[PDB]
Design a binder for this molecule. Structure first.
Ligand SMILES: COC(=O)Nc1ccc2c(c1)NC(=O)CCc1nc(ccc1F)C[C@H](NC(=O)/C=C/c1cc(Cl)ccc1-n1cnnn1)c1nc-2c[nH]1
Length: 238
């Protein structure tokens, strides 16, 4: 996160840090608890991931330093990538992780509500991007979970800012016209959480941008409302 501040423990209890074990253990992506055995993240996170066996999900983490060899985690049973996904910049940048065990909900870890189909019309004015990613293009993974309030941008305005790209309605953008606040390397897969009627909703999944927090370059997110049926299809399979 660029231009963010430290989060407080328990502020984003749906936020997870997805680690990879190969070749050495490191943070890979962010993610969101959406069900007691489901994590919603970005499809691009699994580039070169040959097996779910190398993956470890940690919930209820404020600081990366809380993760040691004795720290408990959730193993991943299955990686479900949207089958239309080719690349982040083309969309369908969405994946589900089915956990090997159930997440016990509590004050440190709980799910975030998916947006409602009627909420496709609502105007979100309180949106936050969270993660342990870089503070600038050439940087490093941050110890403390960072947060940044960023305004949503219309598809029309986002398309003007991304000449040569096709910004679809399955993407949602966020950022200040002058830049300064955004997601960056290592924040992808994480949430764009928006508060509406005292309830937080998973509005986006951090996907891509041209550089980090640049002027007239909004961050591009998977528009979660457009994938609710896909999520239910995969998580409510008979
Ligand atoms: C010690 O541990 C570490 O250093 N861990 C570590 C360190 C960096 C990264 C990963 C892990 N994570 C990954 O590499 C995930 C996998 C992957 N991701 C991308 C491209 C290829 C690819 F393989 C892409 C992924 N991208 C992002 O995360 C976020 C992109 C982004 C999003 C918005 Cl909304 C706006 C601007 C953005 N940016 C534009 N430019 N930069 N950002 C990424 N992730 C790492 C490097 N690139």
């Amino acid at each position: 996160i660029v231009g963010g501040t430290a989060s407080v423990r328990g502020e984003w209890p749906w936020q997870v840090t997805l680690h990879t074990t190969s070749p050495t253990q490191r943070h890979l992506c962010g993610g969101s608890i959406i069900g007691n055995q489901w994590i919603l993240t970005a499809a691009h996170c699994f580039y070169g991931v040959e097996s779910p066996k190398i993956l470890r999900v940690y919930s209820g983490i404020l600081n990366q330093s809380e993760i040691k060899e004795d720290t408990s985690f959730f193993g991943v049973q299955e990686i479900i990538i949207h089958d239309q996904y080719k690349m982040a910049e083309s969309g369908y940048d969405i994946a589900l992780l089915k956990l090997e065990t159930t997440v016990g909900y509590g004050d440190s870890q709980r799910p975030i509500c998916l947006p409602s189909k009627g909420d496709r019309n609502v105007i979100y004015t309180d949106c936050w991007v969270t993660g342990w990613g870089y503070r600038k293009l050439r940087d490093k993974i941050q110890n403390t979970l960072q947060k940044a309030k960023i305004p949503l941008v219309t598809n029309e305005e986002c398309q003007k800012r991304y000449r040569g790209h096709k910004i679809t309605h399955k993407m949602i953008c966020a950022g200040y016209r002058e830049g300064g606040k955004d997601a960056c390397k290592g924040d992808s897969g994480g949430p764009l959480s928006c508060k509406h009627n005292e309830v937080w909703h998973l509005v986006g999944i951090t996907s891509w941008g041209e550089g980090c927090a640049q002027r007239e370059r909004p961050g591009v997110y998977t528009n979660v409302v457009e994938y609710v049926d896909w999520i239910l299809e995969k998580t409510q399979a008979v």
